[PDB]
Curated annotation (Swiss-Prot), chain C:
Impact upon substituting D60A: No effect on transcriptional repression activity
GO biological process: chromatin organization; DNA-mediated transformation; polarity specification of adaxial/abaxial axis; root development; seed dormancy process
Organism the protein comes from: Arabidopsis thaliana (Mouse-ear cress)
Residue(s) carrying N-acetylmethionine: M1
Entry protein name: Histone deacetylase HDT1
Tissues in which the UniProt entry reports expression: Expressed in leaves, roots, stems, young plantlets, flowers and siliques. Highest levels in ovules, embryos, shoot apical meristems and first leaves. Also expressed in somatic embryos.
Oligomeric and partner information: Interacts with DNMT2. Interacts with DEK3.
Region (Required to repress transcription), start-end ranges: 2-5
GO MF annotations in UniProt: histone deacetylase activity; hydrolase activity; zinc ion binding
Keywords: Acetylation, Chromatin regulator, Developmental protein, Hydrolase, Metal-binding, Nucleus, Phosphoprotein, Repressor, Transcription, Transcription regulation, Zinc, Zinc-finger
Main location: nucleus
Swiss-Prot record, chain D:
Note: Loss-of-function mutant (antisense inhibition) induces increased methylation of histone H3 'Lys-4' and hypomethylation of DNA at rDNA repeats.
Protein name: Histone deacetylase HDT1
Tissue: Expressed in leaves, roots, stems, young plantlets, flowers and siliques. Highest levels in ovules, embryos, shoot apical meristems and first leaves. Also expressed in somatic embryos.
GO terms for cellular component: nucleolus
Length: 92, 91, 86, 94, 92
């Protein structure tokens, strides 16, 4: 079981691919630093044929969210904001 | 243990049925896409229970640790969908 | 490991008797609402819900023995939801 | 694995002592009822360390959720004055 | 499995090095003991600098997390008028 984390910028999706036999557990999503805050940030994931919304972050009110997400297969994270950091751990 | 998720549309209850041997763990409920109160309902057996209430401005999502071993129906009410996300795992 | 949940009505305390009962959350149905539990000679407060701001709370509570859940809302119920496991 | 909980009164710090081989897991801290706006820092002492577990608030933050494990003796405390703070969780081996 | 916790003072980022065999699980970050202001939480691990969340004096005094560190990492914050306590447990 080992640390995992990625920085997702605005726009094109970041594709993450667990090696066969490994799970990526995502524990949280947190906004990066913005110096002109006012704004809402939907978090999108694509997994197989499914396109889902993981949550909506907000400057000032909802800078991060906590989660218990497991990815066994390839997945794409995306948003349209600044960056969003997704952090967790890998495990078999 | 593998990814699970559904998009539930308004007034249109989705029935989820775990395959024999498998648990569905629900980790969260999140509003879809911004411009006022959304009770989340579940029906396991005859128990029509309330899982929480989302709110457009303040409570766009909630986090949870819910396990379903048997069939269940998720539902809400008006101008969007609620995504329920988690994972499946054996018993 | 199997689904567990109860509806606690106002002024009608529910006694639950276990297997472990894991409570994962408390949610208002339908101002402030203290949640009370009685376990093993102790009477404790599990949290306070609020109609406009705090409709639910999340928790990691384990009950190995008998316990009683209660609240004093009057104009609704509080749903406690989780799972049973050995 | 079995239920654990304490009521900590204001200015009366409670010392909890796990028997050797047992862990005390604290899952949450919740304000009791008072009567206005008052912040409530939660303190713990473990060995030579004095740490802050969080700050509760009467109107906005009546409780907090946590995943805290104590293998050794520890002291919980707060300075509210007009109430108690309940700490709840479970005991388990290892 | 045993208690772990640190006090990170302002402008003094702490480098944590898990003892051989052990993972450090961080369960939460909490502001110490006015003013309304924001406090980004930073971690450095390997080649990565990531943001764990943003605390706020009036609204968000603490946050809850499920973070696992298998290797050396540095925790840091930018408050200036206090410390941030990171608390959790060590486990093999």
């Amino acid at each position: 079981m080992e640390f995992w984390g990625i920085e997702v910028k605005s726009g094109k999706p970041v594709t993450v691919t667990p090696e066969e036999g490994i799970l990526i557990h995502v524990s949280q999503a947190s906004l990066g630093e913005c110096k002109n805050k006012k704004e809402f940030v939907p978090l999108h994931v694509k997994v197989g044929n499914q396109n889902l919304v993981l949550g909506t972050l907000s400057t000032e009110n909802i800078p991060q969210l906590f989660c218990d997400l497991v990815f066994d297969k390839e997945f794409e994270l995306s948003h349209t904001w600044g960056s969003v950091y997704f952090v967790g751990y890998k495990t078999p």
